[PDB]
Amino acid sequence: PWAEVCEKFQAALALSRVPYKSKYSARALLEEVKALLGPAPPVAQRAVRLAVIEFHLGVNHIDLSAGEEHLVKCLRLLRRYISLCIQAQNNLGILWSEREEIETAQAYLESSEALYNQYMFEKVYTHNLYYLAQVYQHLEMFEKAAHYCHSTLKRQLEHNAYHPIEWAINAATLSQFYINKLCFMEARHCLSAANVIFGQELYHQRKGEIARCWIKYCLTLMQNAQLSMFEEARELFLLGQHYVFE
């Protein structure tokens, strides 16, 4: 019996990879597998095997609020007794945020981070680290959001994957934070680095934001000089990018 349920599971997993191309025959997973796991008879293994199936059924059954009930009882089963709980908890966090109840959604995200640090996967660690930076933006804790944002852009750089529009936009907008805190010698670094990755419709207007960032940089620094009371190199540079801006 074990050989055939393994094949049925693998068939269902392959199916999930596909007018609608969805739902069809996917429900076979539930009836085919539960038909065997039911009479499972340490037997604790049955709890782990059920949790895996319940996880997939919960996520798949999203297309639907009923999916929440499936995810909760999975975590309940696991918590009452090695990385699955983390994968599932992140999903409940996002769900509630999308439902505009971010006051409580943050409770899941912050908990998952503390668990990782204290208790101890690597492939998915950066997801909650990215998402946590976002909810802080709605709570307007600007210093904390800026901190996490930087951490993800740097850590992301280790792993080979890179993108042309992701980095050019995000690295650019971060610079605005340091301009507001009058960091003349630090903000320069961000725009310079962003231009290099970019060098490696959507494909045309993507560049428009970069032009605007350099203009604000140049003007803010010069005007600072008028607080008191041979320098034109900064003015010619500004114009040199102004034509591109226009």
Numbering used by the authors: 5 to 22, 32 to 54, 86 to 107, 111 to 128, 135 to 173, 203 to 282, 301 to 329, 389 to 405
Passage from the reporting paper:
Kinesin-binding protein (KIFBP), which is mutated in Goldberg-Shprintzen syndrome, binds to and inhibits the catalytic motor heads of 8 of 45 kinesin superfamily members, but the mechanism remains poorly defined. KIFBP interacts directly with the motor head of Kinesin-2 (KIF3A), Kinesin-3 (KIF1A, KIF1B, KIF1C, KIF13B, and KIF14), Kinesin-8 (KIF18A), and Kinesin-12 (KIF15) family members, resulting in inhibition of motor-microtubule binding both in vitro and in cells. Collectively, our work describes the molecular mechanism of KIFBP-mediated inhibition of KIF15 and KIF18A via binding to and stabilizing a conformation of the kinesin motor head that is incompatible with microtubule binding.
Given that the resolution of 4.6 Å is not sufficient to build an atomic model, we wanted to improve the resolution of our reconstruction. To this end, we performed masking and three-dimensional (3D) classification on the N-terminal two-thirds of KIFBP to obtain a higher-resolution structure at 3.8 Å. Our atomic model provides a high-confidence positioning of KIFBP residues, allowing us to map the structure onto the KIFBP sequence, confirming α-helical positions, and showing the locations of loops connecting HPs throughout the structure. The relatively small size of KIFBP may be the driving factor limiting the overall resolution of KIFBP alone to ~3.8 Å instead of obtaining higher-resolution reconstructions.
